[PDB]
Amino acid sequence: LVPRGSLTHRKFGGSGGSPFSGLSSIAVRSGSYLDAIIIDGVHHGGSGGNLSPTFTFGSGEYISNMTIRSGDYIDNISFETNMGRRFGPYGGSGGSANTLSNVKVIQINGSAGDYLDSLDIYYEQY
Amino acid sequence: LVPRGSLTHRKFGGSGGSPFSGLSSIAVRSGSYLDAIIIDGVHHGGSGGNLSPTFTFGSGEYISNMTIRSGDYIDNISFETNMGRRFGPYGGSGGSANTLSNVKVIQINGSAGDYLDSLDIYYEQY
């Protein structure tokens, strides 16, 4: 239901230096819903609820497992990394829980106004 | 040469708010090579060369066309958005030029030390 390899990637350059991701850090604001997600310090959403600590990924550390509870809004977020570190759960208990398992999260896009309306998570599936 | 839909995405939540990307802004430092790329204000690379202006994507604006010249390093970067805005060319003239055409760039990962060694660009191909 989309052409094969229409979501893809390509590497340019050589083998030197240390790995980094454009997805460098995450924090959220939350109550019973998600108010905001903050990606690399950039705010996405409202100023309600409570600010989490910032989770900063190490070089070669990435989200390997993620649980989102959602409906018309993001209700809860938690994740785990390949190096065993956990973030959350942050948020409340309403909505359907869905889990990404044994992945490498590449990107988090989404939409937000005063609250966190939706996330669109791009990931490799192992 | 990887399973089908092993690089994928999934949407959570509803239809409200304004779109955002985790890939929010880009600037580079450059001379004849790429010294650094700066993604959402996060520095990746060295402190040599000259700092470009920061390119900030509008809601629903994304890189649709990208030219990278590279070898063992990133030598040149330029891009265009779906809304017609251009960034670069920044860098020098050594290496092989490769173009991504009619895409939507999702993520820029890579590796860097004192210079920008490699980029790994994740994108939809239209």
Side-chain angles (χ1 to χ4, degrees), chain A residues 6 8-10 12-14 16 18 20-22 71-72 106-112 117-121 123-125, chain B residues 6 8-10 12-14 16 18 20-23 71-72 106-112 117-121 123-125:
Chain A
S6 78
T8 192
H9 68 115
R10 177 167 342 171
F12 300 82
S18 319
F20 63 78
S21 183
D72 286 359
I106 301 303
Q107 184 63 286
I108 304 171
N109 298 344
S111 59
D117 297 86
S118 58
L119 293 168
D120 193 356
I121 294 72
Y123 64 90
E124 334 214 332
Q125 180 63 73
Chain B
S6 78
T8 192
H9 68 115
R10 177 167 342 171
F12 300 82
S18 319
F20 63 78
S21 183
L23 177 53
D72 286 359
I106 301 303
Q107 184 63 286
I108 304 171
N109 298 344
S111 59
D117 297 86
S118 58
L119 294 168
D120 193 356
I121 294 72
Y123 64 90
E124 334 214 332
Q125 180 63 73

Side-chain angles (χ1 to χ4, degrees), chain A residues 10-91:
Chain A
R10 177 167 342 171
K11 175 166 167 221
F12 300 82
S15 48
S18 319
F20 63 78
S21 183
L23 177 53
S24 288
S25 70
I26 299 177
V28 297
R29 289 205 159 277
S30 70
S32 46
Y33 289 74
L34 265 94
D35 296 79
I37 185 169
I38 301 115
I39 296 160
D40 298 1
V42 189
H43 193 96
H44 303 295
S47 52
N50 295 116
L51 186 57
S52 78
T54 297
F55 192 102
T56 298
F57 304 93
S59 183
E61 180 177 31
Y62 55 75
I63 297 167
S64 54
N65 194 102
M66 184 166 47
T67 305
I68 299 168
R69 191 182 297 272
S70 69
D72 286 359
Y73 282 94
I74 305 311
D75 293 81
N76 199 289
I77 295 185
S78 72
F79 68 76
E80 180 180 18
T81 71
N82 61 319
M83 243 133 82
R85 291 200 294 144
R86 303 182 161 288
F87 178 82
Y90 290 116

Side-chain angles (χ1 to χ4, degrees), chain B residues 54-100:
Chain B
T54 297
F55 192 102
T56 298
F57 304 93
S59 183
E61 180 177 31
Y62 55 75
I63 297 167
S64 54
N65 194 102
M66 184 166 47
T67 305
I68 299 168
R69 191 182 297 272
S70 69
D72 286 359
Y73 282 94
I74 305 311
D75 293 81
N76 199 289
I77 295 185
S78 72
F79 68 76
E80 180 180 18
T81 71
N82 61 319
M83 243 133 82
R85 291 200 294 144
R86 303 182 161 288
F87 178 82
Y90 290 116
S93 67
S96 299
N98 289 289
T99 297
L100 303 178

